[PDB]
Design a protein around this ligand. Structure first.
Ligand SMILES: *[C@@H]1O[C@H](CO[C@@H]2O[C@@H](C)[C@@H](O)[C@@H](O)[C@@H]2O)[C@@H](O[C@@H]2O[C@H](CO)[C@@H](O[C@@H]3O[C@H](CO[C@H]4O[C@H](CO)[C@@H](O)[C@H](O)[C@@H]4O[C@@H]4O[C@H](CO)[C@@H](O[C@@H]5O[C@H](CO)[C@H](O)[C@H](O)[C@H]5O)[C@H](O)[C@H]4NC(C)=O)[C@@H](O)[C@H](O)[C@@H]3O)[C@H](O)[C@H]2NC(C)=O)[C@H](O)[C@H]1NC(C)=O
Ligand SMILES: *[C@@H]1O[C@H](CO[C@@H]2O[C@@H](C)[C@@H](O)[C@@H](O)[C@@H]2O)[C@@H](O)[C@H](O)[C@H]1NC(C)=O
Lengths: 210, 210
């Protein structure tokens, strides 16, 4: 019993793309009204930082509070495997609970990215399926998104990555588009962001030839 | 105290192909030497049935008994949503344990099956990928396989069903083949089994087009 703590990594797009803002998130739940006092300490490979921000306690429908501290990280430190430990001390806690987290381990492997046009068979339908295969990648942390004419084309689902027969990961993203738009000759591109890619980024395109 | 029961359903493929035998399996573990008699009572939509096969108890390395009862189900009973209950009595229980399982609920929707050849970009590799897209199905229970030349294929992986925006599921399977085989004109076939297909089965084939 007493309060519990969960420790969450940044989003992979946030670590990979230099303008974005990667954060590690330390969540405290089951904080009591009678002992609501929660202090956070943060450490990066065992050294303390003070740039974190702790949110005010928040009451849950279950009568306990939720406490959070968000610690923005340097993209480089996360990608280099630096260790992030959040320390939670609370009256109800005879001993501090410490969770640590860091990037997924393993030697990087550059994803191979392919796009696939719609089946001949599928053209009978009001919509068509553009397919993006990403395989050979390691670790599994990855972001895959679609767009057309610079604009997010968000009408898509993606398999979570799963292990292939050579020990790497693969996944497939499916964007659904109007056959007409496909027929209108519009270009669609698959965007892939992964630590192994140069610039962390590659985009592959397809369209119907005039 | 108490021994515990776990009740497992049949494999979807076994419920779909008439040549196969679908089974509901009731597994009682953590039974003791002092109270070893286990009796099963099986009900299908509440009507007791008498045809299950029970196996002799077998001692586990924790010095407990494992006792498994196998009930053959009729394909169409399962597909029609019948409820199978296994009841297990033992003297170390405050009373019998009951467990009931049945097929996933929801209006079934017919899979749509597409096959896509490898992208021209991939042909410059030692192995290639052929994709099988199966979408718009419901429930998620499904079996997908690949063969060629009258042999099944050994080199595929199939991602879990993904819930699509329209409430249905889709999934992909990826068959990897040496480019030579592909370039040699060999035919590859994706076979999909699902309750909402006529005959519970469809197959789509592709080959290299010169
Ligand atoms: C004492 O020991 C027992 C037995 O354990 C064994 O012996 C001990 C000494 C050790 O050596 C162990 O390493 C060894 O396993 C132990 O029993 C276990 O108890 C725990 C709970 O406390 C059970 O845990 C549950 O497991 C559920 C999932 O179990 C399935 O998957 C696991 C692998 O993840 C298998 O090990 C299980 O056997 C079971 O496998 C499933 O089995 C069914 C029925 O046979 C298969 O379905 C049927 O398949 C056939 C074809 O084969 C047809 O398709 C049929 O139509 C179909 O019905 C099914 O395919 C298979 N699945 C897989 C993935 O293989 C889980 O859901 C629960 O939430 C829970 O975790 C555990 O199962 C159980 N082990 C058993 C029975 O072997 C005791 O706990 C120990 N006691 C103490 C006090 O220590
Ligand atoms: C108390 O609630 C915490 C927050 O859980 C979230 O909101 C609660 C009320 C539920 O609605 C749940 O759906 C959400 O995940 C939990 O993390 C915590 O474990 C809960 N504590 C207890 C003792 O139940």
């Amino acid at each position: 019993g007493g309060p519990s703590v969960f420790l969450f990594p940044p989003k992979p797009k946030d670590t990979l793309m230099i303008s974005r803002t990667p954060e590690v998130t330390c969540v405290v739940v089951d904080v009591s009204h009678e002992d609501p006092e929660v202090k956070f300490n943060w450490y990066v490979d065992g050294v303390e930082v003070h740039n974190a921000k702790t949110k005010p306690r928040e009451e849950q429908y279950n009568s306990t509070y939720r406490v959070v501290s968000v610690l923005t990280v340097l993209h480089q430190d996360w990608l280099n495997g630096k260790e992030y430990k959040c320390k939670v001390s609370n009256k109800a806690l005879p001993a501090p609970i410490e969770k640590t987290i860091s990037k997924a381990k393993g030697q990087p492997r550059e994803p191979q990215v392919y796009v696939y046009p719609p089946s001949r068979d599928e053209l009978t339908k009001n919509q068509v399926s553009l397919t993006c295969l990403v395989k050979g990648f390691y670790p599994s942390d990855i972001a895959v998104e679609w767009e057309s004419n610079g604009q997010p084309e968000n009408n898509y689902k993606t398999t979570p990555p799963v292990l292939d027969s050579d020990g790497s990961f693969a996944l497939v993203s499916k964007l659904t588009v109007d056959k007409s738009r496909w027929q209108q000759g519009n270009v669609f591109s698959c965007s892939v962001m992964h630590e192994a890619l140069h610039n962390h980024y590659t985009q592959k395109s397809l369209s119907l030839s005039p």
